[PDB]
Scaffold this active site. Sequence first.
Site, short mmCIF file in Angstrom:
data_model
loop_
_atom_site.label_atom_id
_atom_site.label_comp_id
_atom_site.label_asym_id
_atom_site.label_seq_id
_atom_site.Cartn_x
_atom_site.Cartn_y
_atom_site.Cartn_z
N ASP A 81 0.81 -1.18 0.00
CA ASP A 81 0.00 0.00 0.00
C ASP A 81 0.85 1.24 0.00
O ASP A 81 0.63 2.12 0.85
CB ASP A 81 -0.89 0.03 1.24
CG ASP A 81 -1.72 1.30 1.34
OD1 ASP A 81 -2.18 1.76 0.28
OD2 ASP A 81 -1.89 1.86 2.45
N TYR B 194 -7.49 -2.66 12.81
CA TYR B 194 -8.31 -1.55 12.36
C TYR B 194 -9.78 -1.79 12.66
O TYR B 194 -10.62 -1.58 11.79
CB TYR B 194 -8.17 -1.33 10.86
CG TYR B 194 -6.80 -0.89 10.44
CD1 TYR B 194 -6.47 0.47 10.41
CD2 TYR B 194 -5.82 -1.82 10.06
CE1 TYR B 194 -5.18 0.89 10.06
CE2 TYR B 194 -4.54 -1.40 9.69
CZ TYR B 194 -4.24 -0.04 9.71
OH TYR B 194 -3.00 0.41 9.33
N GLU C 247 0.13 -0.70 13.99
CA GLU C 247 -0.73 0.09 13.10
C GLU C 247 -2.13 0.12 13.64
O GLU C 247 -2.69 -0.94 13.97
CB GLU C 247 -0.80 -0.49 11.67
CG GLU C 247 0.40 -0.22 10.80
CD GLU C 247 0.30 -0.81 9.40
OE1 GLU C 247 -0.84 -0.95 8.86
OE2 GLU C 247 1.39 -1.12 8.82
N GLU D 144 3.00 -8.06 7.55
CA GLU D 144 1.73 -8.60 7.07
C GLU D 144 1.94 -9.69 6.02
O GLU D 144 1.32 -9.69 4.96
CB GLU D 144 0.81 -7.50 6.54
CG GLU D 144 0.42 -6.45 7.59
CD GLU D 144 -0.64 -5.45 7.08
OE1 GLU D 144 -1.06 -5.56 5.89
OE2 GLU D 144 -1.06 -4.55 7.87
#
Lengths: 588, 588
Positions: free
Chosen positions: A162, A456, A493, A400
């Site tokens: 990303d 998230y 994150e 990840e």
Amino acid sequence: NAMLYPLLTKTRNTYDLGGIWNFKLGEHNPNELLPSDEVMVIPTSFNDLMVSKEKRDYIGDFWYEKVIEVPKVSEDEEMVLRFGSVTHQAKIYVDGVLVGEHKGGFTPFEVLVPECKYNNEKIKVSICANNVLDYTTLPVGNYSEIIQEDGSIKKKVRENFDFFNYAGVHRPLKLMIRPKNHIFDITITSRLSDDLQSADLHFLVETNQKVDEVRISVFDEDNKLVGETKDSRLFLSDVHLWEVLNAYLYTARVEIFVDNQLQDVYEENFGLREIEVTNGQFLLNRKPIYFKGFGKHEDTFINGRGLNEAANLMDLNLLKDMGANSFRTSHYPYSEEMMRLADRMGVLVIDEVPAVGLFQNDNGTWNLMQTKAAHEQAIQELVKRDKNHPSVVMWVVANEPASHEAGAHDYFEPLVKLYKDLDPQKRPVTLVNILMATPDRDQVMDLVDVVCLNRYYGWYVDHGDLTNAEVGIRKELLEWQDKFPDKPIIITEYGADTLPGLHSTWNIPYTEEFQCDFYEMSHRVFDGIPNLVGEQVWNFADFETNLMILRVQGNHKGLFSRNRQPKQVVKEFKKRWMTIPHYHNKKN
Amino acid sequence: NAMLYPLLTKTRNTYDLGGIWNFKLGEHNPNELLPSDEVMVIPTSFNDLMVSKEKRDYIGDFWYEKVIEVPKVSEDEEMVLRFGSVTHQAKIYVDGVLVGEHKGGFTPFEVLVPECKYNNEKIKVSICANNVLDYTTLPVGNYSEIIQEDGSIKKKVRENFDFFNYAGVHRPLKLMIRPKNHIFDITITSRLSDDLQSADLHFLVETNQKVDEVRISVFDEDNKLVGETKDSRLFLSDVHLWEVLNAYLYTARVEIFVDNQLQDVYEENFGLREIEVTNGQFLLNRKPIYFKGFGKHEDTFINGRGLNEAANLMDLNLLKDMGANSFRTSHYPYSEEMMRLADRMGVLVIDEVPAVGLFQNDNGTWNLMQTKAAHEQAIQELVKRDKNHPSVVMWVVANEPASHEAGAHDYFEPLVKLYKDLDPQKRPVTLVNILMATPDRDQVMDLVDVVCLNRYYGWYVDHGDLTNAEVGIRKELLEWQDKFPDKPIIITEYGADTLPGLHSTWNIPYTEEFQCDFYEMSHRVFDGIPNLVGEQVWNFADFETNLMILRVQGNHKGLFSRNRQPKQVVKEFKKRWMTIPHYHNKKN
Ligand SMILES: [Mg+2]
Ligand SMILES: [Mg+2]
């Protein structure tokens, strides 16, 4: 071979080669002379300097070329070109002759200029950069070729990550004149005393050739001599420790001698501090730390991924003004300059290799993930470059990866060993974990020292629904804590896309107010998880990405804008992080 | 004495001293050692790196300090510190001893390191910068001191100009080892032939000491030898001219010799082109030019006024993609780097000294404008630094001085002479004129070669009322044309504050649509003024200013944002400027 920061010393002439270079996208015969039709600057990403999309999206070879004056090189010296990095692959030419090569866009390398050319007036340096990412590169790219009916072939890379695939010569290039017989590497090791007041130092100096004497002179921050050795061993009484946000740096002047005369001299900084992980805690100098800070990017308007030392400092000033104390080099090693700055400022750094994208996208029967070689090399280069930095407290093996799929364990097992085998300090290594790889599914986390999670809830899961996000985040952290009662947990994150100017009374995702609400909910949970020892927001600042529907002209999860102007939520973090001490033991 | 761009040659070792320096706002004893509590980067403005307003607004002494290794210096060599610039005033210390000094924040200077220190291992360099502006400095500041009851004194500068007073070491600092007897200056002069196909070259080389031989070897863009002389004179047959947006650069390798051996070698670029002004036209290579481009600023997020070579290139790429061909260095000399880039790209440059702010704010009986010395120095330094650049086509003596008030003529008369007396090429000099100084009132414009006007009808006068603005702009340009039928006119500033995102159907100032309408109206007038030979928008990009009610977080008259993203109006300029040729004779 390029593990030492290029310094000017009485034995080492270091020349900056930065500035304007002839430039071309596409094919070029290095025996011929590139025109000054196109130019490019070193250092900088090339992409944003292109006015058209087709040029900015170019994929393949592109060239930098300049005729360079040859300085005086004596019989006992040699001349090397030293690159902070070239992104992503590089072939280096002298006078049309291939003379060196490198793969990996974020680590330094050197290239010897052929001795036979030292009595020449000028040499032409040609740099063939390449920005293709693969299943064999790090970061991992989805590579494809489509014929144009032109019929030239259009190369493209669908990033498996990303962040925008900025390419070019992002870091300073140096012309380096040094002794044939020189100091190749210096490794600094210390055993601190029981009470942390003294340090038994071991300076391990590597040479290529015989040396008669190796003198090491250590100086404190006042440049006063505090120790000297000729045997690689030094005992320092009553040292000043390197403490979080309160750095103390010694510098080790290393001089080598042959037949009663100076052959080479180098100055390497070090800091004294101890790291340990036990009982779900991260100890620094035998006290429990609480991480507060940012996932970052080397990203900036105009320069893209190019080095901007002033952005490093403005970020770090803001970090410390906020009461923060750390950051992660997501998702690739930062520049040496940034590392030396973190050391000078006392900021903790989680140092990572570019192992992002290790995730497929039926099916997959055939061996498509050929990343192992690049991974091993990345790890060696980072540890060799960064091992002496007191600011580096932990290594990351991957960001990840698909750690829940069969074969994951066996891929990472040897790579985690590699960090251990290479790091004189045996710092903790971690693995940063995606939401898919949940406590039950995941099969890699037993291998690591610290649990790092990107989560998230309230943004990707339960979007804009805090009530349910809270139950989800809490639930999962309790499962992690339970599965690994031993290991500390760090949220590496968490955040929410936020566009400056977007406002609402009704806690609406993308508004500045929602960003605040999201973090309140998250911290309310964290504060009740005993083994959670650190929190690092995603992201420090907004940053550039490729075209994807959930990216609104880049990523906007930053507490600051790309221009480093604050969003509403900055005031909130400042109140929280100035209230939580750096040495904070929760538990209690 | 620092008129030559610092190059690496076999006789000249040039070391970059940039990076991290110890830093302090306020007082410091250079005999003592600055702590690493504060650091600062070189090069960059310091202001934006400060997290608090009080620090960002600091006025007075501030210090940079670093201990630097001494390279090998042979008996016939000397060592100098060479500053691109320090803003605004600088005192330089070696080992606590004052060793050089400079006033003027935008021009380079060198400082000799005392010979007695060459056999030392290390030297401490201390830079005491100062950012006070005065009635004796350029740019002109309104200086005042208020006692705090602390009772320390708070210094402040109320800028007499519309740009934020960024300060610091904005440009690369070099440690330079060169021959005692070296080439001090090179002036390149050419007389082109009747048909513009050949050039009689005169290379005027300055030395400090006797030289036996001065060999000059000229190379074309293919590095092929095309001429050689030992008498300072060279005739070149069938040259390639430096043409607008199509540059051609020769390079003059200058070697000096004493007793049959190389003492010093330097490479200076030049370009061949002719400039003339007559009949209300600006001739380049004897063809009439039409200027299209920008007033610019050296301004960028984070770095402030610090040098960013990648911004220079991104701007220049955009400029040329738009069909533009020029820009003005408003309101101070740009970096050497930018000049060399304009040469390489064929962009025309109007080169100006920092003479902005020459305007009081009863009354004024006493001599408050003590700017003459600084003005004379600025002019000498700019001409000495920039005279060889083919891209420099005109000089500016002042921006928006009070040219309508008594005493104006007599102030500028000798300064305009100075440009003439100093410029081997005797390029045109201009004066940029404010709206107050109307054709009747003004008393300076007879002295200059080209009429430059900053005009804002539809923005400052007749705000948002285009119908009447049009009549006003036209009326005045006709008066100018009439008063000086001889001189060409160039609009050096016109534009309208525009915030990205602001939109309206009703031609509303500050909206993107109004920006478009404003320029349409302006160009409709310009196209009917025969003696108007150029148009330069204010500004290329949005930029930082001080606090003043008509500045909405800086100046927003830019066609681009500060981050270099386009506003609506960019498409329009691209259509217009790609339709108007560079060599455009209106008249007809
Ligand atoms: Mg498979
Ligand atoms: Mg007066």
